[PDB]
Structure 1
């Protein structure tokens, strides 16, 4: 019935998933199929905050960098990991936590 969660568990840099795991650059375009996902275009910078596990492991969560130095969109959304190239690890994405009800809400 209701939209099933994309995953039951995820990997983060910390329990709250508030620190980014990595900085990545998009290699492919990706238009979000619904509000849970992030729309990205080749060349954009994405800060990765979560990596889903198990059934949702193709997808990562993060935010897109803006146009002025230092700008990161507030909105978090999911995207296929394969569309980006991770360029710098900021923190190990080792903290294994459960996804909550708010993770896939939009």
Structure 2
């Protein structure tokens, strides 16, 4: 399975800080373990934005039901299914993707 992208944009070198908070406008079911499953209205925190050949996809995690809860797992989803509501930190750190980046969590 080829990497989805060779490079990505993050808020920091380790992609540890979220770039943005977004709300899902469409449902999306993960086609394989690399992807997130999302439903309309759910909140997603975006930690990376892929570049190049993977640029339709962003990486992040789904907010849970209790205040402050964010699932630990990261996965990819199409950027178009969400509306970014708050830019938390500019996503302008241009990083090569590593092998952890497409290994399923």
TM normalised by structure 1 equals 0.98
Compute the displacement of 1:10 (Å): 0.1
Compute the displacement of 1:67 (Å): 0.4
Compute the displacement of 1:45 (Å): 0.1
Distance 1:6 1:25 in 2: 23
- 1:44-91 Cα offsets, whole Å, 9 max, x none, are 000000000000000000000000000000000000000000000000
5 Å-filtered alignment, 1:75-94, equals 75-94=73-92
Structure 1 unaligned residues grouped into runs of 5+: none
Compute the displacement of 1:31 (Å): 0.1
- 1:8-65 Cα offsets, whole Å, 9 max, x none, are 0000000000000000000000000000000000000000000000000000000000
Structure 2 unaligned residues grouped into runs of 5+: none
Distance 1:102 1:71 in 2: 23
Compute the displacement of 1:92 (Å): 0.1
- C-alpha RMSD of matched pairs (Å): 0.2
Distance 1:47 1:40 in 2: 12
